[PDB]
């Protein structure tokens, strides 16, 4: 038994020991209570954030067109509007969102997430959409008929102004798909521009876990 065993002299980063204090006199400022306190990083991963869906080439430079997707009376039923890989941390549609940005500080994570659709059109507009989900390891539906036979939620706009799908079994290609499809064309009151929009928001749901810290890829070095 000795205190000079191999590896007792060395400085190892990320190894915790006590250290002497520069001032062992002054150290005194009483703490006060301050509203809002964060003690875990899953307290800001379960907060909603508006995800950009629309990506063109300048509908995301000026990005107030980035968060909303056009709808029209012109379009016929059974044509999809948007869709995405569903894989946060590697798909740029939700990896620069508030929730998604936390998962670029870790490698390997799991849990479930929940997406939210909000229709922001007029209060006299009514339509029906068929939301759809494909399990991982199966391609996106190619027809509204295909989509329907999968898992689907018929969301009536004109009753509900939002819908929440809670999608289990995400973790990191293979991965599910979310697709929205017209079931009917939108019914205008008398509007002469048939522009109606919907937004989408995303947040982590309930239990979630991360392991093993690593540095983010979105900032590159010093420059000053």
């Amino acid at each position: 038994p000795t205190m000079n065993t191999p590896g007792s002299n060395q400085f190892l980063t990320s190894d915790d020991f006590q250290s002497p204090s520069a001032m062992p006199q002054f150290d005194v400022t009483p703490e006060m209570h301050i509203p809002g306190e964060v003690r875990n990083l899953m307290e800001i991963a379960e907060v909603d954030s508006v995800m950009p869906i629309n990506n063109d080439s300048a509908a995301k430079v000026s990005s107030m067109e980035a968060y909303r997707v056009e709808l029209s009376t012109n379009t016929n039923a059974g044509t999809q509007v948007f869709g995405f890989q569903l894989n946060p941390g590697a798909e740029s549609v939700m990896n620069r969102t508030l929730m998604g940005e936390i998962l670029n500080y870790y490698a390997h994570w799991s849990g479930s997430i929940k997406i939210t659709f909000v229709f922001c059109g007029s209060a006299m507009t009514t339509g029906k959409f068929l939301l759809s989900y494909a399990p991982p390891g199966a391609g996106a539906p190619k027809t509204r008929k295909d989509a329907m036979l999968g898992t689907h939620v018929v969301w009536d706009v004109g009753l509900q102004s939002s819908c929440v799908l809670c999608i289990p079994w995400i973790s990191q290609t293979n991965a599910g798909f979310v697709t929205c499809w017209y079931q009917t064309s939108v019914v205008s009151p008398a509007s002469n521009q048939p522009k109606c929009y919907m937004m989408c928001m995303v947040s982590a749901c309930n239990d979630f876990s991360v392991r093993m810290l690593r540095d983010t890829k979105f900032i590159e070095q010093t420059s000053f």
């Binding site: 191999p6 590896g7 190894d15 293979n174 093993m212 690593r214």
Partner: protein, 220 residues
């Protein structure tokens, strides 16, 4: 004897220190070809070690890495400081002596000076799997057309080494030799011992060999 044995426990059949690598690097500018050096952590380099970890199909353990390092000058200064940096898998890596990958805050690093007991630190079990796999029988891709065996399984970090002092007249060359041992082993599912000499360090490829030595005749 007089009681049950305990020299044939799994924990004492493994967990012995062994040399696994050594490498060289030397003081010099970032222009100079060799002035930092690296080693990728693997246990398939050394034949003797490899034999005893292919006794089992699944293992999980923490490991201790101790590096013992010597240096010598060459023909015609202050004590040298060496940095050993562990990079967890999926981190950034340096491509030269000077990078922001030695200044990164998420890669553990040990500064150590000569004339001290050799540096070491343990690395805890790292893998999203619940055990390391010593045999695998799949492909990297989701359709078979990937790389056969040892894909994203059995992937661990890697070390890097450099001097921390500025270059100064008269080159100094260091040789660092790496010792490795696992600890807290647990084994699941045994295998029959390997019979044919290892060829590749990433495949189970082998050349056919006789089962046993000849005898002069089977009768006594």
């Amino acid at each position: 004897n007089n009681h049950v044995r305990s020299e044939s426990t799994i924990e004492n059949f493994l967990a012995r220190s062994a040399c696994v690598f050594y490498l060289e690097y030397k003081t010099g500018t970032k222009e100079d070809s060799n002035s930092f050096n690296n080693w990728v952590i693997t246990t398939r380099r050394v034949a003797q070690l490899r034999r005893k970890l292919e006794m089992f199909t699944y293992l999980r353990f923490d490991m201790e890495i101790t590096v013992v390092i010597t240096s010598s000058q060459d023909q015609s200064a202050p004590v040298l400081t060496h940095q050993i940096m562990y990079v967890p898998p999926g981190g950034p890596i340096p491509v030269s002596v000077d990078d922001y990958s030695w200044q990164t805050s998420t890669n553990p690093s040990i500064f150590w000076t000569e004339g001290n007991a050799p540096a070491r630190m343990s690395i805890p079990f790292i893998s999203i799997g619940n055990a390391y796999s010593n045999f695998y029988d799949g492909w990297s891709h989701f359709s078979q057309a990937g790389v056969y065996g040892f894909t994203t399984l059995n992937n661990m970090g890697q070390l890097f080494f450099r001097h921390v002092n500025k270059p100064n007249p008269a080159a100094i060359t260091s040789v660092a030799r790496i010792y490795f041992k696992p600890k807290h082993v647990r084994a699941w599912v045994p295998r029959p011992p390997r019979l044919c000499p290892y060829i590749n360090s990433t495949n189970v490829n082998f050349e056919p060999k006789p089962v046993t030595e000849v005898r002069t005749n089977i009768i006594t």
